[PDB]
């Protein structure tokens, strides 16, 4: 699949993932520094039999922002595709939902995008 | 079918004219409807939509500045109008705040809203 390994965003935030023959994504996401207090569990899924017509490989994953040190009471999902070749990339859009009261639920969810590459900047 | 007044579930009141040129113009205000709560909107809609029961595509923007308040932010609604006895405007929205570059990652909220012709 070309997905297993370490991926970096432009800040050097670092996820290390295994993409199994079972379609599973499992790993960790952490900061460029990589101290334990920055590391969180990552779990998701990917298309283990992508099209053979020059299309990317669809995937997604979730991180809940709780570890042994901090709990932000929130979770982010990334939905995107892996694009192989000379400069492999994972292009994503993300949704970050905070746990809120009902009165604040309207402002619970941030949206954005990020791109990951195999080369640490 | 778009021109007129529309309400969300809280009774927030969207007052719009859909012009023959494809323009949306109007105001958006709270259920109370005091002047401090009223903001200008502008947008566009498909002026020659499908005639088969499909919705009419539309969108509009409110910048959250009026003569009384300024939140330094703007919301866009993207959606469709569906007519008939139980007419609806079904939307998803993006709310972007003016931020520093360091805070831009958390500048944009996403949500949804539904408008009807009765409170």
């Amino acid at each position: 699949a070309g997905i297993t390994g370490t991926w970096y965003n432009q800040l050097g935030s670092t996820f290390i993932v295994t993409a199994g023959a079972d379609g599973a994504l499992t790993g960790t996401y952490e900061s460029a520094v990589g101290n334990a207090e920055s590391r969180y569990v990552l779990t998701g899924r990917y298309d283990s039999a992508p099209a053979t017509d020059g299309s990317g490989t669809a995937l997604g994953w979730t991180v809940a922002w709780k570890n042994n040190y901090r709990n932000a009471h929130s979770a982010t999902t990334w939905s995107g595709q892996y694009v192989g070749g000379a400069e492999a990339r994972i292009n994503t859009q993300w949704l970050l939902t905070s746990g809120t009261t009902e009165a604040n639920a309207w402002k619970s969810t941030l949206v954005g995008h990020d791109t990951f590459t195999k080369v640490k900047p | 079918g778009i021109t007129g007044t529309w309400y969300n579930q809280l009774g927030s009141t969207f007052i719009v004219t859909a012009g023959a040129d494809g323009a949306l113009t109007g105001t958006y205000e709270s259920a109370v409807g005091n002047a401090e709560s009223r903001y200008v909107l502008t947008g566009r809609y498909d002026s020659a939509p499908a005639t088969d029961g499909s919705g009419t595509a539309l969108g509009w923007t409110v910048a959250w500045k009026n003569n009384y308040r300024n939140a330094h932010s703007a919301t866009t609604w993207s959606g469709q109008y569906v007519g008939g006895a139980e007419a609806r405007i079904n939307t998803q929205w993006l709310l972007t705040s003016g931020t520093t570059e360091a805070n831009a990652w958390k500048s944009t909220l996403v949500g949804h809203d539904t408008f009807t012709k009765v409170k």
Binding site: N9, Q10, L11, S13, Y29, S31, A32, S38, Y40, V63, W65, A72, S74, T76, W94, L96, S98, L110, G112, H113, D114 | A102, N103, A104, W105, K106
Partner: peptide, 11 residues
């Protein structure tokens, strides 16, 4: 912050 900024390409 609602979650770690670094994780979302910011900060």
């Amino acid at each position: 912050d609602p979650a770690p900024a670094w994780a979302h390409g910011g900060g």
